Symmetry: C2
Subunit: 386 residues, 2 copies
């Protein structure tokens, strides 16, 4: 049951199933995985495709010849299984040179290098068919207040993204950019910490239409925010270009648990929203099989990601299809929220005595919203207890 197939558009980063298990207080527990093995094993599990940071595919410091060898064998695995590469990104956080950031490093020479490293990988991403190029500025930020002048840093971040937009436009590439927010970790505070901050920043870019967000479940939850609400705002703005799915148990270090784990109810409301809105992008998992696991546990956790999406999809569909739920939505006036407040116009509203002078505030206040019955029907559907 709940068997994933390629048309579900489930994708995984090479760094996810390939995570060797090095955490903040521990050494690796698993050997490195060959990207070719990951492509084949994920295809066998029903995945649609894979994603990568430049340095996941090509060892940092590779010569052109070595680079070609690594890419060629990866492309052969893609050609053999029909696996796609819908998104790619740059590693601007592992190497010690990026200790104070890539695009917003205080050192100007580092900022220039970060852009050149990014541009090289945009070309490769385009060759492999990526539709979205993600940017996760994990080193952009500070541990102390005087270390980073944030207005200057935002000028530098805008400059970098504007140069990247000029580059893709000049080359005639159709690829678009997606900024992936995170509030903290590895930096004390990271710039553009939430979906909101990233959406706002994009509106200051020279070509805003080329940029959207790649929200990650766990990242918004690291700020204690409601992920489904943030995704609704990104959809409302026309900016949900991609999404990173995983689990997180509250406000703490970035867990990257398999999707479904962590906040289960939020996962249900997220899937309900993605399916009801008709999101058509990749269902990408950015997760880390816990370091307690061996390679069998790695594939069992990857399979669990997809399985939980599919179970939740079925429950959300059953919830929305239930006439008792549609009745409860009407009882809670969900449909009334879709009606314009004042399509009659400002003057009409001002002249409408029923909107103020003769408005029965006490009768309106006494009307229960019936949200608890609605939510218990949602709970019953999620648990299969109807």
């Amino acid at each position: 049951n709940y068997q994933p197939t390629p048309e579900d558009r489930f994708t995984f980063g090479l760094w996810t199933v390939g995570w060797q298990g090095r955490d903040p207080f521990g050494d690796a527990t698993r050997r490195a995985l060959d990207p070719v093995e990951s492509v084949r094993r994920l295809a066998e599990l029903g995945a649609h495709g894979v994603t990568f940071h430049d340095d996941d595919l090509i060892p940092f410091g590779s010569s052109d010849s070595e680079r070609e060898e690594h890419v060629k064998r990866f492309r052969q695995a893609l050609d053999d299984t029909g696996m796609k590469v819908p998104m790619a990104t740059t590693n601007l956080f592992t190497h010690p040179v990026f200790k104070d950031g890539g695009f917003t490093a205080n050192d100007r020479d580092v900022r220039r290098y970060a852009l050149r490293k990014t541009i090289r990988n945009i070309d490769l991403a385009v060759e492999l068919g990526a539709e979205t190029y993600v940017a996760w500025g994990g080193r952009e930020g500070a541990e102390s207040g005087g270390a980073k002048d944030v207005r200057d840093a935002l000028d530098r971040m805008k400059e970098a993204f504007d140069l990247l937009g000029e580059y893709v436009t000049s080359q005639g590439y159709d690829i678009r950019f997606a900024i992936e927010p995170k509030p903290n970790e590895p930096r004390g505070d990271i710039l553009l910490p939430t979906v909101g901050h990233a959406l706002a920043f994009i509106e200051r870019l020279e070509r805003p239409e080329l940029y959207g967000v790649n929200p990650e479940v766990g990242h918004e939850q690291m700020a204690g925010l409601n992920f489904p609400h943030g995704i609704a705002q990104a959809l409302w703005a026309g900016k949900l270009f991609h999404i990173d799915l995983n689990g997180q148990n509250g406000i703490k270090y970035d867990q990257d648990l398999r999707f479904g784990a962590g906040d289960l109810r939020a996962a249900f409301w997220l899937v309900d929203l993605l399916e009801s809105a008709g999101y058509s992008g990749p269902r990408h998992f950015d997760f880390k099989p816990p370091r307690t696991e061996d390679f069998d546990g790695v594939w069992a956790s990857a399979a669990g990601c997809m399985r939980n999406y599919l179970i939740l999809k079925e429950r959300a569909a059953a919830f929305r299809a239930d006439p008792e739920v549609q009745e409860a939505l009407r009882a809670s006036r969900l449909d009334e929220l879709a009606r314009p407040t004042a399509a009659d116009g400002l003057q009409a509203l001002l002249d409408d005595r029923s909107a103020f002078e003769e408005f029965d505030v006490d009768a309106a206040a006494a009307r229960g919203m019936a949200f608890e019955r609605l939510d218990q029907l949602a709970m019953d559907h999620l648990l299969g207890a109807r």
Copy 2:
């Protein structure tokens, strides 16, 4: 020492010093304050002005004659003291009619009422000299996932703000709007939860230039975010129209402690930023003298708000003026952060071998940022331990 005077632009909400101390677990500990007394006492402490919600000044449900008497008395106190009213706002959260929101209530009749209530108070705020009209949508949101279709709610929120923009433009008013974010409380999750989300939302309004943010220290801190960073993004966007100052001790209920309390280092970096950026708006305190206090404690707490801003202003100015700090900023390359990354342009950057092939990544990585020395000089200045 550190005596506030009117040109410091310190302002207070009537509801701050007037908070009777009622919380959900306890009854009022202080009698209601007459707004006239608050105006007089705040003026004696060196305040520049006061702000109000409609219902703080005019009891909800007041007749026209009652309304006129309350406004007349308040105007007389302002006239007598010279106190200004730079900002006002609407109470769209106390009355039970707003239990599911004002602008985004599921019930359409409540949304219309919320707009009429707001428009009535905009006229009064303009007459009293306000430059900014704040909106805190404290009831906009949900406790459960199915209760609110967030995309429809954002359509309704946009419609409401667009109608208010149409209204002030039709009347020829110069007043501007400021959205005050909060992530949660009183709702399980509130819409437009952070500075970022509000900034992004403003870019979808019909007349974006009329709207900015009114960020509150404690509210961004309720999401564990860096308040100075969020203020820097608002300044960078040209949207810091007003600000709410207070204290908060981490991730918990909204404390509204006096300014300086809570995260003291963040208060220092905030004042450093506001003064270095030349923010010219009100330094508004949205605080609650703890309910442990009597009226003497209310005025001591209000005085402490202003005193702490002035101490921090002195220490931030001494920090920035110190030649040893200017040297440390150079050692940490804060000056390089202000230089464009690639004003030579994209083609020059692509052709620059010093930015890629010939970039000595190990030499750059070996350079210490010297951020700890810089931060310890900041600590020494804040504590007067130089």
